[PDB]
Design a protein around this ligand. Structure first.
Ligand SMILES: [K+]
Ligand SMILES: [Mg+2]
Ligand SMILES: [Mg+2]
Ligand SMILES: [Mg+2]
Ligand SMILES: [Mg+2]
Ligand SMILES: [Mg+2]
Ligand SMILES: [Mg+2]
Ligand SMILES: [Mg+2]
Ligand SMILES: [Mg+2]
Ligand SMILES: [Mg+2]
Ligand SMILES: [Mg+2]
Ligand SMILES: [Mg+2]
Ligand SMILES: [Mg+2]
Ligand SMILES: [Mg+2]
Ligand SMILES: [Mg+2]
Ligand SMILES: [Mg+2]
Ligand SMILES: [Mg+2]
Ligand SMILES: [Mg+2]
Ligand SMILES: [Mg+2]
Ligand SMILES: [Mg+2]
Ligand SMILES: [Mg+2]
Ligand SMILES: [Mg+2]
Ligand SMILES: [Mg+2]
Ligand SMILES: [Mg+2]
Ligand SMILES: [Mg+2]
Ligand SMILES: [Mg+2]
Ligand SMILES: [Mg+2]
Ligand SMILES: [Mg+2]
Ligand SMILES: [Mg+2]
Ligand SMILES: [Mg+2]
Ligand SMILES: [Mg+2]
Ligand SMILES: [Mg+2]
Ligand SMILES: [Mg+2]
Ligand SMILES: [Mg+2]
Ligand SMILES: [Mg+2]
Ligand SMILES: [Mg+2]
Ligand SMILES: [Mg+2]
Ligand SMILES: [Mg+2]
Ligand SMILES: [Mg+2]
Ligand SMILES: [Mg+2]
Ligand SMILES: [Mg+2]
Ligand SMILES: [Mg+2]
Ligand SMILES: [Mg+2]
Ligand SMILES: [Mg+2]
Ligand SMILES: [Mg+2]
Ligand SMILES: [Mg+2]
Ligand SMILES: [Mg+2]
Ligand SMILES: [Mg+2]
Ligand SMILES: [Mg+2]
Ligand SMILES: [Mg+2]
Ligand SMILES: [Mg+2]
Ligand SMILES: [Mg+2]
Ligand SMILES: [Mg+2]
Ligand SMILES: [Mg+2]
Ligand SMILES: [Mg+2]
Ligand SMILES: [Mg+2]
Ligand SMILES: [Mg+2]
Ligand SMILES: [Mg+2]
Ligand SMILES: [Mg+2]
Ligand SMILES: [Mg+2]
Ligand SMILES: [Mg+2]
Ligand SMILES: [Mg+2]
Ligand SMILES: [Mg+2]
Ligand SMILES: [Mg+2]
Ligand SMILES: [Mg+2]
Ligand SMILES: [Mg+2]
Ligand SMILES: [Mg+2]
Ligand SMILES: [Mg+2]
Ligand SMILES: [Mg+2]
Ligand SMILES: [Mg+2]
Ligand SMILES: [Mg+2]
Ligand SMILES: [Mg+2]
Ligand SMILES: [Mg+2]
Ligand SMILES: [Mg+2]
Ligand SMILES: [Mg+2]
Ligand SMILES: [Mg+2]
Ligand SMILES: [Mg+2]
Ligand SMILES: [Mg+2]
Ligand SMILES: [Mg+2]
Ligand SMILES: [Mg+2]
Ligand SMILES: [Mg+2]
Ligand SMILES: [Mg+2]
Ligand SMILES: [Mg+2]
Ligand SMILES: [Mg+2]
Ligand SMILES: [Mg+2]
Ligand SMILES: [Mg+2]
Ligand SMILES: [Mg+2]
Ligand SMILES: [Mg+2]
Ligand SMILES: [Mg+2]
Ligand SMILES: [Mg+2]
Ligand SMILES: [Mg+2]
Ligand SMILES: [Mg+2]
Ligand SMILES: [Mg+2]
Ligand SMILES: [Mg+2]
Ligand SMILES: [Mg+2]
Ligand SMILES: [Mg+2]
Ligand SMILES: [Mg+2]
Ligand SMILES: [Mg+2]
Ligand SMILES: [Mg+2]
Ligand SMILES: [Mg+2]
Ligand SMILES: [Mg+2]
Ligand SMILES: [Mg+2]
Ligand SMILES: [Mg+2]
Ligand SMILES: [Mg+2]
Ligand SMILES: [Mg+2]
Ligand SMILES: [Mg+2]
Ligand SMILES: [Mg+2]
Ligand SMILES: [Mg+2]
Ligand SMILES: [Mg+2]
Ligand SMILES: [Mg+2]
Ligand SMILES: [Mg+2]
Ligand SMILES: [Mg+2]
Ligand SMILES: [Mg+2]
Ligand SMILES: [Mg+2]
Ligand SMILES: [Mg+2]
Ligand SMILES: [Mg+2]
Ligand SMILES: [Mg+2]
Ligand SMILES: [Mg+2]
Ligand SMILES: [Mg+2]
Ligand SMILES: [Mg+2]
Ligand SMILES: [Mg+2]
Ligand SMILES: [Mg+2]
Ligand SMILES: [Mg+2]
Ligand SMILES: [Mg+2]
Ligand SMILES: [Mg+2]
Ligand SMILES: [Mg+2]
Ligand SMILES: [Mg+2]
Ligand SMILES: [Mg+2]
Ligand SMILES: [Mg+2]
Ligand SMILES: [Mg+2]
Ligand SMILES: [Mg+2]
Ligand SMILES: [Mg+2]
Ligand SMILES: [Mg+2]
Ligand SMILES: [Mg+2]
Ligand SMILES: [Mg+2]
Ligand SMILES: [Mg+2]
Ligand SMILES: [Mg+2]
Ligand SMILES: [Mg+2]
Ligand SMILES: [Mg+2]
Ligand SMILES: [Mg+2]
Ligand SMILES: [Mg+2]
Ligand SMILES: [Mg+2]
Ligand SMILES: [Mg+2]
Ligand SMILES: [Mg+2]
Ligand SMILES: [Mg+2]
Ligand SMILES: [Mg+2]
Ligand SMILES: [Mg+2]
Ligand SMILES: [Mg+2]
Ligand SMILES: [Mg+2]
Ligand SMILES: [Mg+2]
Ligand SMILES: [Mg+2]
Ligand SMILES: [Mg+2]
Ligand SMILES: [Mg+2]
Ligand SMILES: [Mg+2]
Ligand SMILES: [Mg+2]
Ligand SMILES: [Mg+2]
Ligand SMILES: [Mg+2]
Ligand SMILES: [Mg+2]
Ligand SMILES: [Mg+2]
Ligand SMILES: [Mg+2]
Ligand SMILES: [Mg+2]
Ligand SMILES: [Mg+2]
Ligand SMILES: [Mg+2]
Ligand SMILES: [Mg+2]
Ligand SMILES: [Mg+2]
Ligand SMILES: [Mg+2]
Ligand SMILES: [Mg+2]
Ligand SMILES: [Mg+2]
Ligand SMILES: [Mg+2]
Ligand SMILES: [Mg+2]
Ligand SMILES: [Mg+2]
Ligand SMILES: [Mg+2]
Ligand SMILES: [Mg+2]
Ligand SMILES: [Mg+2]
Ligand SMILES: [Mg+2]
Ligand SMILES: [Mg+2]
Ligand SMILES: [Mg+2]
Ligand SMILES: [Mg+2]
Ligand SMILES: [Mg+2]
Ligand SMILES: [Mg+2]
Ligand SMILES: [Mg+2]
Ligand SMILES: [Mg+2]
Ligand SMILES: [Mg+2]
Ligand SMILES: [Mg+2]
Ligand SMILES: [Mg+2]
Ligand SMILES: [Mg+2]
Ligand SMILES: [Mg+2]
Ligand SMILES: [Mg+2]
Ligand SMILES: [Mg+2]
Ligand SMILES: [Mg+2]
Ligand SMILES: [Mg+2]
Ligand SMILES: [Mg+2]
Ligand SMILES: [Mg+2]
Ligand SMILES: [Mg+2]
Ligand SMILES: [Mg+2]
Ligand SMILES: [Mg+2]
Ligand SMILES: [Mg+2]
Ligand SMILES: [Mg+2]
Ligand SMILES: [Mg+2]
Ligand SMILES: [Mg+2]
Ligand SMILES: [Mg+2]
Ligand SMILES: [Mg+2]
Ligand SMILES: [Mg+2]
Ligand SMILES: [Mg+2]
Ligand SMILES: [Mg+2]
Ligand SMILES: [Mg+2]
Ligand SMILES: [Mg+2]
Ligand SMILES: [Mg+2]
Ligand SMILES: [Mg+2]
Ligand SMILES: [Mg+2]
Ligand SMILES: [Mg+2]
Ligand SMILES: [Mg+2]
Ligand SMILES: [Mg+2]
Ligand SMILES: [Mg+2]
Ligand SMILES: [Mg+2]
Ligand SMILES: [Mg+2]
Ligand SMILES: [Mg+2]
Ligand SMILES: [Mg+2]
Ligand SMILES: [Mg+2]
Ligand SMILES: [Mg+2]
Ligand SMILES: [Mg+2]
Ligand SMILES: [Mg+2]
Ligand SMILES: [Mg+2]
Ligand SMILES: [Mg+2]
Ligand SMILES: [Mg+2]
Ligand SMILES: [Mg+2]
Ligand SMILES: [Mg+2]
Ligand SMILES: [Mg+2]
Ligand SMILES: [Mg+2]
Ligand SMILES: [Mg+2]
Ligand SMILES: [Mg+2]
Ligand SMILES: [Mg+2]
Ligand SMILES: [Mg+2]
Ligand SMILES: [Mg+2]
Ligand SMILES: [Mg+2]
Ligand SMILES: [Mg+2]
Ligand SMILES: [Mg+2]
Ligand SMILES: [Mg+2]
Ligand SMILES: [Mg+2]
Ligand SMILES: [Mg+2]
Ligand SMILES: [Mg+2]
Ligand SMILES: [Mg+2]
Ligand SMILES: [Mg+2]
Ligand SMILES: [Mg+2]
Ligand SMILES: [Mg+2]
Ligand SMILES: [Mg+2]
Ligand SMILES: [Mg+2]
Ligand SMILES: [Mg+2]
Ligand SMILES: [Mg+2]
Ligand SMILES: [Mg+2]
Ligand SMILES: [Mg+2]
Ligand SMILES: [Mg+2]
Ligand SMILES: [Mg+2]
Ligand SMILES: [Mg+2]
Ligand SMILES: [Mg+2]
Ligand SMILES: [Mg+2]
Ligand SMILES: [Mg+2]
Ligand SMILES: [Mg+2]
Ligand SMILES: [Mg+2]
Ligand SMILES: [Mg+2]
Ligand SMILES: [Mg+2]
Ligand SMILES: [Mg+2]
Ligand SMILES: [Mg+2]
Ligand SMILES: [Mg+2]
Ligand SMILES: [Mg+2]
Ligand SMILES: [Mg+2]
Ligand SMILES: [Mg+2]
Ligand SMILES: [Mg+2]
Ligand SMILES: [Mg+2]
Ligand SMILES: [Mg+2]
Ligand SMILES: [Mg+2]
Ligand SMILES: [Mg+2]
Ligand SMILES: [Mg+2]
Ligand SMILES: [Mg+2]
Ligand SMILES: [Mg+2]
Ligand SMILES: [Mg+2]
Ligand SMILES: [Mg+2]
Ligand SMILES: [Mg+2]
Ligand SMILES: [Mg+2]
Ligand SMILES: [Mg+2]
Ligand SMILES: [Mg+2]
Ligand SMILES: [Mg+2]
Ligand SMILES: [Mg+2]
Ligand SMILES: [Mg+2]
Ligand SMILES: [Mg+2]
Ligand SMILES: [Mg+2]
Ligand SMILES: [Mg+2]
Ligand SMILES: [Mg+2]
Lengths: 121, 129
RNA sequence: ACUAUGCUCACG
RNA sequence: GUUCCCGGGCCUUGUACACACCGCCCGUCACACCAUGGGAGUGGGUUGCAAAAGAAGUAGGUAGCUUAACCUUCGGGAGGGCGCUUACCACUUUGUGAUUCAUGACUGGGGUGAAGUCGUAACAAGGUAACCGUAGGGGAACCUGCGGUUGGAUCACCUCCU
RNA sequence: UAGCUAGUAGGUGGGGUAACGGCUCACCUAGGCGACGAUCCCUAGCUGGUCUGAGAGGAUGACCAGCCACACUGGAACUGAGACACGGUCCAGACUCCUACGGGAGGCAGCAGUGGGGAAUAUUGCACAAUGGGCGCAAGCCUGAUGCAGCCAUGCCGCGUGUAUGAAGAAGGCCUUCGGGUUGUAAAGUACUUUCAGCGGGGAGGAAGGGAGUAAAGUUAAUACCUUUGCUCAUUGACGUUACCCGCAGAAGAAGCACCGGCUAACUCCGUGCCAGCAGCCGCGGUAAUACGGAGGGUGCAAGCGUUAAUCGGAAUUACUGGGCGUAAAGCGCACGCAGGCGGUUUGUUAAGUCAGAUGUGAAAUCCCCGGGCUCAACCUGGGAACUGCAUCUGAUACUGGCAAGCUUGAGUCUCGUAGAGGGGGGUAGAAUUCCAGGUGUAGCGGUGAAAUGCGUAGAGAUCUGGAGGAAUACCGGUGGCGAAGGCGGCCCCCUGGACGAAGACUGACGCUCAGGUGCGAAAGCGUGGGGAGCAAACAGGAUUAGAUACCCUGGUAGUCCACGCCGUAAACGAUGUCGACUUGGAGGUUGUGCCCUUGAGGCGUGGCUUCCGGAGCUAACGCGUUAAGUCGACCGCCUGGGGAGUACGGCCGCAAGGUUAAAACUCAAAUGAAUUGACGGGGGCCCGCACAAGCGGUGGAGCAUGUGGUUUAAUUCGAUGCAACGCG
RNA sequence: GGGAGAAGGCACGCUGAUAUGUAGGUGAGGCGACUUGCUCGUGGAGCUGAAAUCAGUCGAAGAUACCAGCUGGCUGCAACUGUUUAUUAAAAACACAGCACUGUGCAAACACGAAAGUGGACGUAUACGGUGUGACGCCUGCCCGGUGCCGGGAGGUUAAU
């Protein structure tokens, strides 16, 4: 406030940080993968959630969630990554794209198959 | 310390109306009389004088129609911290043209309605709804 | 006088 | 007989409580993960200053060699061209800083994790009112001093007065 | 990032340049720049525009157009009108090349293409036919500039996938109120058309010309050559089996994929059981899931649909339009004050601002209206406004500024007083505490919830006598006063700051705020030197307790005191920045000064400062309320979710303790304020009941009966489990 | 204050010219004047004389000989200059300023001396002696059973007499 104060020091716009540092406004990004493993979520849930550490191509080391029943990821195996927090596993803030590269589709899905990467029956 | 005298005038009016008060004394001036005349001429204030020689005290006499006051609202636009000069076509119209904007133009102080037809703009002193 | 604690989640 | 004990009722107040004191809840310690500071250092990136360096070119200076047109008296003059040299200056070399990005044994705290250990610091007068500054102390919340705040509670307890 | 700069800044002598000039010399002067952010650091082509937005704005600079820059990296100049030259020369470099090893090459950020990078962007295509440009008298070369098409759901837009009738309301699925409904006019069908690709015949329109030999009219000595307008000719199409117009056949070749708990258009059955999985936000699953997986059923879009990333929007969540700061985040602890912002009142004059007209110009494109050509649209295009622009002369002078000379109401001076723990320096008083020696005197004192440590028969405690020393000032003393805030209490002098009142006189706007700057700033700390009764961190011992590094008790050092320097913080608080104006009241406190009879502790005003309650108004509410949190103005400070964190890093400051400035990653969907109803309290008040007291007899000990637990067993069926299960069903 | 001569650089010879040797330095005769001179100003005759700059110029090399720092980085100990085992130890040992404890009221404590007497000191507690520690900065925690020391004086024990 005070018009003179604003002339002297203008309104600094709140530079809101991005949720997903995959950099350069990239839709997806490849990842070599290390350590596929099971983790427990926060309080009201209780489960064994499937997750893997992603060694990205640009240099970053993140965790991506393995959405769907069962997976073909192990030790290495190159996978594709998209943006999206799970909102349960604290730390995990990316999603593996099922279908693309070594990450196969979920076995025997019918409803919603672009999600989870399955072809027609 | 008493930097803007014109804003102080318009508060004595606005606060005087709020108290249901008949008259409103204040220190006079050239510009005070100009504004107070434009308010009188359209019909917010019902008569005024400028009684005094050395130390002139301009007193207004506020109008009341019902129990409600006549001046619904009144506010300083071109305060001294931020002067506001508007062009002919860019002159405002308060309350969609049924309240007035007092505007100091080069041919004396006048209403925004008079300033349009006269064909000139100026410093918009106050809105009077 | 002083005198501790209550394992998790659950009322569209 | 109503002081205390157990329960209940009504009014009133405080409340960080609301499966509603069998309430909530603090910090250390243990374990897991993540980001993060310090760290003997190590390794790149950019860059300042102080120098050396001098390729080509251009400009100046010309003992040396050399020559179409001008002037020639057919001796040679002028003028050029090589070559040489001086200045500017590129690559490159040296020293020393600056900054920035990686990385480092170990280490300091921080965050996060359904059901670990130790206590109970706060919320009620939370059982020593709490908190703020500061100093010392202490496994841990914290405790104690000095000063400050009310964002403290009760005032039919006395026994006698407003 | 607060200082930077020596050809640096000027001037001249010379010198160069197309030309002005430190562009370059020689001297001469020693400046120039910078808080209106220099310098340094990071990032970046710029604009017309694009995108979003109601608009202001925010974002942005692909595609078309203008300008700049660069050409393997780093230099350099030459040649010309024009370059320090994109396929020029020249060096030096790195990295590929060819070498007969002496020496030679080479430069796709022109078009295709490769590897590589990547989440990801295209064919070693086709033609100069048009449209430019280069060349030339032109006949035409060359033109991967233009034109096209390969590829690509990557867009904006169009048409497709059939169209009538169809009851047995088929079956099969699917729910079943096993009666039936439902998918469902859906299908199968029963009639008709054939768009669209797929075959085939016709076949526009991109094309103006160019060229020949010609007539005339120009040209001229000339009916020659040349030129122009009539004028006769033949032809030119990459795209191209064009666009398009007719015929072939027969529904034929042509539909997904999201979603379905709320937000948000749309329901059930199974399978699973806090597992498997969904998740944009809230949140779904613990054996009857509308949220998970499946199925049907629906809904929403459909040649695309979802997800993803990215910008604006909603977000008035950086608020200029358009927010706030008593308690939610947020008033610096309080002053002084330069630069800066703002400034009472009255005439005169300039016109800087402002306003009015003036001409220029805002390249064309898009964007916007009236039109037009694509069969329609998309696209294309003609004109119009628009282009909210920025400059330029002329006036208007109200307002603001500049410059006048005032005026006196703000502000200040003097004059006489009033009150006050305002300050600083020096004295001195009385009570008491501790202690010191002395008299008396006989067992305890002290302390606590209760005890003990402690102190005492060496004679304490108690009592009195005389000292010594230190610190603090009972009562007065108050919702009293003073101070900017911090803060300041015995009495007396010394020096000293302000406040207020009374009526004048004087000055004549001298004012208000204040980033940096600077001062003062409780307590605790810190340094050097004094002092040291009481008190008392630390510390010790005795208790308490499960433990008690606490609370309680007995001891007790730094410190609290002083002088001088530092520190620079507090819930430094009315959690409320300073100054000024304005708008109903009541009761008081406190200090003035008037009018009246002091006629008797009064009668009646009117200034300061102050406490309490309340009106309008405001506020989320609580509350504030003429001492505003009301209504307005001036300026400053500050705020932008909670944690991380007032922390780290650097800077400054400090002897240190540390202060001050002040982030980011990461993480959470809350954190927060006020108030409401309960419940609770080792909160308060009032009551009650074999609740307790006052009794009386019991259980708990024994044996036995019964009933549970457990254990045993082939089975010891099952249920009931604090009170309110256990001689219970 | 330092570190710091940190490190690391570059320039130097000779000869001309600026200036037929200059900024300066010392300044004679001369000109006036004051008082009375071993005068003042005043002017500069010689004489002396760097250091620069610009140009030349020789050598492999110009501070050309003699002369005359090696430098930097991490670290233990001692703050420092100093002192020490004459003659195998120069150090981290001693001292040191500063720090604390402690004694000492002056005929001081203490010291040398059968003593007289000196020193301490012709000083007087901001002084003196002893002891430890060792600039400076941040600090210096707990124990008084043992041994010493200080104070206390009842009781017990206790010599000479
Ligand atoms: K203080
Ligand atoms: Mg579903
Ligand atoms: Mg206009
Ligand atoms: Mg426990
Ligand atoms: Mg609990
Ligand atoms: Mg619980
Ligand atoms: Mg009760
Ligand atoms: Mg009742
Ligand atoms: Mg209460
Ligand atoms: Mg409270
Ligand atoms: Mg309260
Ligand atoms: Mg409350
Ligand atoms: Mg619960
Ligand atoms: Mg509890
Ligand atoms: Mg905790
Ligand atoms: Mg914590
Ligand atoms: Mg050189
Ligand atoms: Mg050369
Ligand atoms: Mg030349
Ligand atoms: Mg040459
Ligand atoms: Mg010759
Ligand atoms: Mg010849
Ligand atoms: Mg001859
Ligand atoms: Mg000659
Ligand atoms: Mg010649
Ligand atoms: Mg170089
Ligand atoms: Mg280099
Ligand atoms: Mg860094
Ligand atoms: Mg590292
Ligand atoms: Mg590191
Ligand atoms: Mg390791
Ligand atoms: Mg655990
Ligand atoms: Mg835990
Ligand atoms: Mg407490
Ligand atoms: Mg507690
Ligand atoms: Mg307690
Ligand atoms: Mg307490
Ligand atoms: Mg407490
Ligand atoms: Mg409390
Ligand atoms: Mg502290
Ligand atoms: Mg201390
Ligand atoms: Mg400790
Ligand atoms: Mg322990
Ligand atoms: Mg303690
Ligand atoms: Mg305490
Ligand atoms: Mg204690
Ligand atoms: Mg209170
Ligand atoms: Mg009672
Ligand atoms: Mg000078
Ligand atoms: Mg819009
Ligand atoms: Mg908007
Ligand atoms: Mg728009
Ligand atoms: Mg481009
Ligand atoms: Mg342009
Ligand atoms: Mg290129
Ligand atoms: Mg090139
Ligand atoms: Mg080049
Ligand atoms: Mg160029
Ligand atoms: Mg070229
Ligand atoms: Mg080139
Ligand atoms: Mg070559
Ligand atoms: Mg080459
Ligand atoms: Mg090329
Ligand atoms: Mg290319
Ligand atoms: Mg290239
Ligand atoms: Mg390729
Ligand atoms: Mg192709
Ligand atoms: Mg071709
Ligand atoms: Mg061809
Ligand atoms: Mg061809
Ligand atoms: Mg061609
Ligand atoms: Mg052709
Ligand atoms: Mg052409
Ligand atoms: Mg052409
Ligand atoms: Mg021509
Ligand atoms: Mg021809
Ligand atoms: Mg051709
Ligand atoms: Mg060619
Ligand atoms: Mg071609
Ligand atoms: Mg085609
Ligand atoms: Mg498009
Ligand atoms: Mg697109
Ligand atoms: Mg049909
Ligand atoms: Mg269906
Ligand atoms: Mg049909
Ligand atoms: Mg059919
Ligand atoms: Mg049909
Ligand atoms: Mg067709
Ligand atoms: Mg035809
Ligand atoms: Mg044609
Ligand atoms: Mg043509
Ligand atoms: Mg023709
Ligand atoms: Mg053809
Ligand atoms: Mg052809
Ligand atoms: Mg085609
Ligand atoms: Mg065809
Ligand atoms: Mg075709
Ligand atoms: Mg036919
Ligand atoms: Mg037919
Ligand atoms: Mg839903
Ligand atoms: Mg609803
Ligand atoms: Mg719905
Ligand atoms: Mg059923
Ligand atoms: Mg879903
Ligand atoms: Mg059912
Ligand atoms: Mg189910
Ligand atoms: Mg469906
Ligand atoms: Mg869509
Ligand atoms: Mg998004
Ligand atoms: Mg927004
Ligand atoms: Mg906004
Ligand atoms: Mg605003
Ligand atoms: Mg806000
Ligand atoms: Mg708060
Ligand atoms: Mg607050
Ligand atoms: Mg304040
Ligand atoms: Mg204050
Ligand atoms: Mg000012
Ligand atoms: Mg004015
Ligand atoms: Mg005037
Ligand atoms: Mg005049
Ligand atoms: Mg005029
Ligand atoms: Mg015009
Ligand atoms: Mg025109
Ligand atoms: Mg125009
Ligand atoms: Mg557009
Ligand atoms: Mg267009
Ligand atoms: Mg149209
Ligand atoms: Mg068509
Ligand atoms: Mg047009
Ligand atoms: Mg147009
Ligand atoms: Mg036009
Ligand atoms: Mg028109
Ligand atoms: Mg027109
Ligand atoms: Mg335009
Ligand atoms: Mg004029
Ligand atoms: Mg006039
Ligand atoms: Mg001004
Ligand atoms: Mg002025
Ligand atoms: Mg006057
Ligand atoms: Mg005053
Ligand atoms: Mg008096
Ligand atoms: Mg006083
Ligand atoms: Mg006084
Ligand atoms: Mg006083
Ligand atoms: Mg005083
Ligand atoms: Mg004093
Ligand atoms: Mg006394
Ligand atoms: Mg006494
Ligand atoms: Mg005695
Ligand atoms: Mg005695
Ligand atoms: Mg005892
Ligand atoms: Mg005892
Ligand atoms: Mg005794
Ligand atoms: Mg004794
Ligand atoms: Mg005795
Ligand atoms: Mg006694
Ligand atoms: Mg006594
Ligand atoms: Mg006494
Ligand atoms: Mg005394
Ligand atoms: Mg006061
Ligand atoms: Mg005040
Ligand atoms: Mg005095
Ligand atoms: Mg004052
Ligand atoms: Mg005064
Ligand atoms: Mg007065
Ligand atoms: Mg005046
Ligand atoms: Mg006057
Ligand atoms: Mg200030
Ligand atoms: Mg300040
Ligand atoms: Mg101070
Ligand atoms: Mg003070
Ligand atoms: Mg001070
Ligand atoms: Mg103090
Ligand atoms: Mg002290
Ligand atoms: Mg000290
Ligand atoms: Mg001392
Ligand atoms: Mg003491
Ligand atoms: Mg005590
Ligand atoms: Mg105590
Ligand atoms: Mg303690
Ligand atoms: Mg003891
Ligand atoms: Mg204790
Ligand atoms: Mg104990
Ligand atoms: Mg005591
Ligand atoms: Mg005192
Ligand atoms: Mg004193
Ligand atoms: Mg003093
Ligand atoms: Mg200070
Ligand atoms: Mg301060
Ligand atoms: Mg503060
Ligand atoms: Mg205070
Ligand atoms: Mg207070
Ligand atoms: Mg108050
Ligand atoms: Mg505050
Ligand atoms: Mg002030
Ligand atoms: Mg006054
Ligand atoms: Mg009210
Ligand atoms: Mg308001
Ligand atoms: Mg209210
Ligand atoms: Mg208030
Ligand atoms: Mg008032
Ligand atoms: Mg008033
Ligand atoms: Mg007042
Ligand atoms: Mg006020
Ligand atoms: Mg206010
Ligand atoms: Mg408020
Ligand atoms: Mg913020
Ligand atoms: Mg935040
Ligand atoms: Mg945050
Ligand atoms: Mg800090
Ligand atoms: Mg500093
Ligand atoms: Mg310091
Ligand atoms: Mg300290
Ligand atoms: Mg701050
Ligand atoms: Mg959490
Ligand atoms: Mg809060
Ligand atoms: Mg509350
Ligand atoms: Mg209770
Ligand atoms: Mg109660
Ligand atoms: Mg009964
Ligand atoms: Mg009883
Ligand atoms: Mg009995
Ligand atoms: Mg009995
Ligand atoms: Mg029993
Ligand atoms: Mg029995
Ligand atoms: Mg028994
Ligand atoms: Mg029997
Ligand atoms: Mg049994
Ligand atoms: Mg058995
Ligand atoms: Mg049973
Ligand atoms: Mg049972
Ligand atoms: Mg059971
Ligand atoms: Mg029951
Ligand atoms: Mg050296
Ligand atoms: Mg030096
Ligand atoms: Mg040399
Ligand atoms: Mg020489
Ligand atoms: Mg001479
Ligand atoms: Mg000469
Ligand atoms: Mg000579
Ligand atoms: Mg000479
Ligand atoms: Mg010479
Ligand atoms: Mg001479
Ligand atoms: Mg001379
Ligand atoms: Mg001379
Ligand atoms: Mg001379
Ligand atoms: Mg002399
Ligand atoms: Mg003489
Ligand atoms: Mg001479
Ligand atoms: Mg020399
Ligand atoms: Mg030279
Ligand atoms: Mg030479
Ligand atoms: Mg040489
Ligand atoms: Mg030498
Ligand atoms: Mg040496
Ligand atoms: Mg060193
Ligand atoms: Mg060692
Ligand atoms: Mg030494
Ligand atoms: Mg040492
Ligand atoms: Mg010696
Ligand atoms: Mg010696
Ligand atoms: Mg010796
Ligand atoms: Mg020796
Ligand atoms: Mg010796
Ligand atoms: Mg010997
Ligand atoms: Mg030796
Ligand atoms: Mg030796
Ligand atoms: Mg030595
Ligand atoms: Mg040593
Ligand atoms: Mg020593
Ligand atoms: Mg000391
Ligand atoms: Mg001492
Ligand atoms: Mg002796
Ligand atoms: Mg003697
Ligand atoms: Mg003596
Ligand atoms: Mg020693
Ligand atoms: Mg320290
Ligand atoms: Mg010790
Ligand atoms: Mg002892
Ligand atoms: Mg003891
Ligand atoms: Mg002993
Ligand atoms: Mg003794
Ligand atoms: Mg003794
Ligand atoms: Mg004795
Ligand atoms: Mg005795
Ligand atoms: Mg005896
Ligand atoms: Mg005997």
């Amino acid at each position: 406030a005070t018009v003179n104060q604003l002339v002297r020091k203008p309104r600094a716009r709140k530079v809101a940080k991005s949720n997903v540092p995959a950099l350069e406004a990239c839709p997806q990004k490849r990842g070599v993968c290390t350590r596929v493993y099971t983790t427990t979520p926060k309080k009201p849930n209780s489960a064994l959630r499937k997750v893997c550490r992603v060694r990205l191509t640009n240099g970053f080391e993140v965790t991506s969630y393995i959405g769907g029943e069962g997976h073909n990821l192990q030790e290495h195996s190159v996978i594709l990554i998209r943006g999206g927090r799970v909102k349960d596993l604290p730390g995990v803030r990316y999603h593996t794209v099922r279908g693309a590269l070594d990450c196969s589709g979920v076995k025997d899905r019918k409803q919603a198959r672009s999600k989870y990467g399955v072809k027609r029956p | 310390s008493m930097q803007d005298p014109i804003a102080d005038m318009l508060t004595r009016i606005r606060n005087g109306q709020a108290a249901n008060k008949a008259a409103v004394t204040m220190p006079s001036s050239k510009l005070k009389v100009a504004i107070a005349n434009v308010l009188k001429e359209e019909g917010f204030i019902e008569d005024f004088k400028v009684e005094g020689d050395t130390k002139p005290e301009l007193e207004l006499t506020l109008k009341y129609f019902q129990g409600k006051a006549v001046v619904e609202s009144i506010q300083r636009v071109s305060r001294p911290g931020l002067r506001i000069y508007k062009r002919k076509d860019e002159l405002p119209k308060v309350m969609a043209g049924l309240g007035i904007a007092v505007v100091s133009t080069s041919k004396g102080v006048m209403t925004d309605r008079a300033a349009r037809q006269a064909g000139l703009g100026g410093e918009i002193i106050c809105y009077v709804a």
